[PDB]
Enzyme design. Sequence first.
Site, mmCIF file in Angstrom:
data_model
loop_
_atom_site.group_PDB
_atom_site.id
_atom_site.type_symbol
_atom_site.label_atom_id
_atom_site.label_comp_id
_atom_site.label_asym_id
_atom_site.label_seq_id
_atom_site.Cartn_x
_atom_site.Cartn_y
_atom_site.Cartn_z
ATOM 1 N N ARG A 148 29.152 48.240 42.074
ATOM 2 C CA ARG A 148 28.914 49.642 41.741
ATOM 3 C C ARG A 148 29.366 49.947 40.323
ATOM 4 O O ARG A 148 28.804 50.818 39.656
ATOM 5 C CB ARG A 148 29.633 50.557 42.734
ATOM 6 C CG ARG A 148 31.041 50.939 42.337
ATOM 7 C CD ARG A 148 31.761 51.668 43.419
ATOM 8 N NE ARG A 148 32.592 50.732 44.154
ATOM 9 C CZ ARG A 148 33.878 50.521 43.891
ATOM 10 N NH1 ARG A 148 34.454 51.217 42.909
ATOM 11 N NH2 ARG A 148 34.590 49.634 44.607
ATOM 12 N N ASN A 149 30.376 49.217 39.868
ATOM 13 C CA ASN A 149 30.901 49.366 38.530
ATOM 14 C C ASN A 149 30.247 48.437 37.532
ATOM 15 O O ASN A 149 30.736 48.282 36.415
ATOM 16 C CB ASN A 149 32.393 49.112 38.507
ATOM 17 C CG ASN A 149 33.168 50.214 39.170
ATOM 18 O OD1 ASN A 149 32.717 51.369 39.205
ATOM 19 N ND2 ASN A 149 34.351 49.877 39.695
ATOM 20 N N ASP A 191 39.337 47.288 39.361
ATOM 21 C CA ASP A 191 38.316 47.987 40.113
ATOM 22 C C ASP A 191 36.984 47.286 39.952
ATOM 23 O O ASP A 191 35.929 47.922 39.967
ATOM 24 C CB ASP A 191 38.199 49.430 39.648
ATOM 25 C CG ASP A 191 37.362 50.302 40.583
ATOM 26 O OD1 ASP A 191 36.865 49.815 41.620
ATOM 27 O OD2 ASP A 191 37.192 51.497 40.248
ATOM 28 N N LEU A 240 22.768 62.226 35.831
ATOM 29 C CA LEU A 240 22.574 60.906 36.391
ATOM 30 C C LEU A 240 23.278 60.771 37.717
ATOM 31 O O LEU A 240 22.722 60.282 38.689
ATOM 32 C CB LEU A 240 23.089 59.858 35.422
ATOM 33 C CG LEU A 240 22.272 59.824 34.147
ATOM 34 C CD1 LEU A 240 22.901 58.861 33.172
ATOM 35 C CD2 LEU A 240 20.862 59.401 34.482
ATOM 36 N N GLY A 241 24.513 61.234 37.753
ATOM 37 C CA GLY A 241 25.273 61.239 38.978
ATOM 38 C C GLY A 241 26.338 62.300 38.951
ATOM 39 O O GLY A 241 26.872 62.614 37.901
ATOM 40 N N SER A 242 26.644 62.844 40.116
ATOM 41 C CA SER A 242 27.765 63.742 40.269
ATOM 42 C C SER A 242 28.630 63.234 41.391
ATOM 43 O O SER A 242 28.127 62.882 42.443
ATOM 44 C CB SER A 242 27.284 65.144 40.602
ATOM 45 O OG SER A 242 28.378 66.012 40.821
ATOM 46 N N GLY A 243 29.932 63.188 41.164
ATOM 47 C CA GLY A 243 30.863 62.915 42.236
ATOM 48 C C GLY A 243 32.241 63.429 41.897
ATOM 49 O O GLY A 243 32.608 63.506 40.726
ATOM 50 N N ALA A 244 33.013 63.776 42.916
ATOM 51 C CA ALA A 244 34.422 64.074 42.727
ATOM 52 C C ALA A 244 34.656 65.144 41.670
ATOM 53 O O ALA A 244 33.974 66.163 41.638
ATOM 54 C CB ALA A 244 35.178 62.804 42.360
ATOM 55 N N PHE A 245 35.619 64.883 40.794
ATOM 56 C CA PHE A 245 36.009 65.812 39.735
ATOM 57 C C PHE A 245 34.929 66.065 38.705
ATOM 58 O O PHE A 245 34.785 67.178 38.207
ATOM 59 C CB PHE A 245 37.269 65.318 39.025
ATOM 60 N N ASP A 303 33.785 51.452 34.166
ATOM 61 C CA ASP A 303 34.820 52.091 34.972
ATOM 62 C C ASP A 303 36.176 51.476 34.761
ATOM 63 O O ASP A 303 36.739 50.838 35.655
ATOM 64 C CB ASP A 303 34.466 52.072 36.446
ATOM 65 C CG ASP A 303 34.622 53.426 37.071
ATOM 66 O OD1 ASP A 303 35.775 53.761 37.456
ATOM 67 O OD2 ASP A 303 33.597 54.149 37.146
ATOM 68 N N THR A 353 30.975 64.797 36.625
ATOM 69 C CA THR A 353 29.589 64.397 36.758
ATOM 70 C C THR A 353 29.118 63.727 35.483
ATOM 71 O O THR A 353 29.656 63.987 34.421
ATOM 72 C CB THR A 353 28.716 65.624 36.982
ATOM 73 O OG1 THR A 353 28.927 66.540 35.908
ATOM 74 C CG2 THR A 353 29.091 66.296 38.275
#
Length: 302
Positions: A145-146, A141, A22-27, A159, A29
């Site tokens: 987006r969250n 946070d 669905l999504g990959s980011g940072a550390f 999140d 996915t």
Amino acid sequence: EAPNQALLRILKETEFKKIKVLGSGAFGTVYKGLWIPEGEKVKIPVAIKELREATSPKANKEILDEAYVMASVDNPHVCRLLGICLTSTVQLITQLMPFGCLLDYVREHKDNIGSQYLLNWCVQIAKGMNYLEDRRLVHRDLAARNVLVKTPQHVKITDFGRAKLLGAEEVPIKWMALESILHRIYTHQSDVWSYGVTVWELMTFGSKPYDGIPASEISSILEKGERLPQPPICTIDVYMIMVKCWMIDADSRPKFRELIIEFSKMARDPQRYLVIQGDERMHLPEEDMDDVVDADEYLIPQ
Ligand SMILES: CN1CCN(c2ccc(Nc3ncc4nc(Nc5ccccc5)n(C5CCCC5)c4n3)cc2)CC1
Ligand SMILES: [Cl-]
């Protein structure tokens, strides 16, 4: 302080399969997945959140903290953790939201997005935020987006990684209250401010706050008394509610239960409070799925 008796559920990797990213980011996915509970004959659509092959403990400490919080919350407008996998690096399994995060959703479907939907989302987000207040949790946070969309009618907060208990010792500048930016002070009222900005994102259809401005500057800008602009679709009443969230005095800021009430009122006559073109016109929406059950529908003892 009452004991937390939330059950933490441990799930075997055999129980579920990852289908897509669905999504990959940072550390880490996130994958769309199907989870079949042992000997239950139900299939549950899930998102699995996993970090990298790198397994560094500090990362693990952070992930588990997040899991802890998600395990501990039970509200219709708050995302809940179904279980975790301990396979090699840890994974968090939570109910899947088909339509994704709200921020993407407004941007994608702005032409077809009604005023009624917008006000409802505000109501629902405030409902979720109030529940966290009840549990004495500070999200720290809050952002569009969250926020994730189960359906256009239904949205939930997510999140909980930065989340902390109120009055506990223990970075998105634009969202952050001023008190928090200067002094790293966080309170439910600090959360309310972030809410204000979240509302602004929806009204502004996913526009980035303080666009073109460096974060370091922002503290001064807020210091001056500058605030985000009133969105075109926004009536003075709606914007005025936004501005109250951005008050210097946190106590002056509206309580989440008050925000639910006020926006509720507006949803009865949505057209009066938000002006959108063609508002009336707008409407909004692997072989065997017979056994599919949504997470909300799937329940367990306790
Ligand atoms: C244009 N595309 C449209 C489709 N799309 C998408 C993304 C997510 C979902 N659903 C869904 N569900 C649960 C999620 N839980 C986390 N994150 C999360 C956080 C804590 C614990 C478990 C998951 N996410 C993130 C939100 C964006 C990337 C995935 C989640 N996302 C459905 C569709 C990607 C953009
Ligand atoms: Cl930022």
